[PDB]
From Swiss-Prot, chains A, B:
Species classification: Viruses, Monodnaviria, Sangervirae, Phixviricota, Malgrandaviricetes
Subunit structure: Pentamerizes and interacts with H protein, G and B pentamers to form 12S pre-assembly complex. By binding with protein D, induces joining of twelve 12S complex to form the procapsid. The procapsid has an external scaffold made of 240 copies of protein D, 60 copies of the internally located B protein, and contains 60 copies of each of the viral structural proteins F and G. Upon genome packaging, interacts with protein J. The mature virion is composed of 60 copies each of the F, G, and J proteins, and 12 copies of the H protein.
Family of this protein: Belongs to the microviridae F protein family.
The protein, known as: Capsid protein F
Organism (species): Escherichia phage alpha3 (Bacteriophage alpha-3)
Interval of the full protein contained in this chain: 145 to 288 of 431
Subcellular location as annotated: Virion
Function as written in the Swiss-Prot or TrEMBL entry: Assembles to form an icosahedral capsid with a T=1 symmetry, about 30 nm in diameter, and consisting of 60 capsid proteins F. Upon virus binding to host cell, one of the spikes dissociates from the capsid and the virus interacts with LPS through the exposed EF loops on the F proteins. After the genome had been ejected, the channel formed by the F proteins at the unique fivefold axis remains open.
Superkingdom of this protein's organism: Viruses
Length: 144, 144
């Protein structure tokens, strides 16, 4: 929530924010506040089995939310409904491309560099956005 | 359970008993003694999860009963069996008809009644019982 580009720090402002590593077991853990146990109160000597039933149901709603419905839009999708991008002010994703960056090695050829190599990665790529209709004034930003 | 027509009160005896309003949220509530919680005892520090399981099962039988199997005949139907009308001494329903009672308005036509109306409801109707076999002596009663 920085208010001005001037509230950003050296690195961020010049290179952009940092993003998440590709997903793996250690970089895609369940949200840190994930419940590991759900307590349910009980009268000194008895337990309301009907309440216990509700308790679970309630928990279920809580979990679903924590695990994958943390964003309003996703909760509404949960019900089988939908939301315009104006509903939560989300930028509209118009096109997403992804590709691997490969290249070649350069062979060292002098007395000491003979048998050495330097990797030069150089990948060509196309990123094409199909004719899009702009309903209101604004910006079309493309990032990498 | 009145024993003699003479044990009936003025209104009842002359006009018949009162019946339930058409079903709606406030006139078709779950039977007043419907369970809102089912307690299950538990040893001071532990709970028998196997018992809890049975507890629910038992409850289920209790609920089903309260909600819709309060009559013997309905419990037996529950098992996929059947009962003669002699089993619980139920009168045999031979024919049930239902219809709406509409009519017309009568227009007022004198100096003060001009522009006034009186509703006269008058509905024609047929109630036909298909040839029925009477197995034993008795009565064929038709009520409205």
């Amino acid at each position: 929530t920085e208010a001005n580009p001037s509230n950003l720090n050296e690195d961020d402002a010049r290179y952009g924010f940092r993003c998440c590593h590709l997903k793996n077991i250690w970089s895609a853990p369940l949200p840190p506040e994930t419940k590991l146990a759900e307590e349910m109160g009980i009268e000194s000597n008895s337990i309301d089995i009907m309440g216990l039933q509700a308790a679970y149901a309630q928990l279920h709603t809580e979990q679903e939310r924590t695990y994958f419905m943390q964003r309003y839009r996703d909760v509404i999708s949960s019900f089988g409904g939908s939301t315009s991008y104006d509903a939560d002010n989300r930028p509209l994703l118009v096109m997403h491309t992804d590709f691997w960056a490969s290249g070649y090695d350069v062979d060292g050829t002098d007395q000491s560099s003979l048998g050495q190599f330097s990797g030069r990665v150089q990948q060509t790529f196309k990123h094409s956005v199909p004719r899009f209709f702009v309903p209101e004034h604004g910006v079309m930003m493309t990032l990498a």
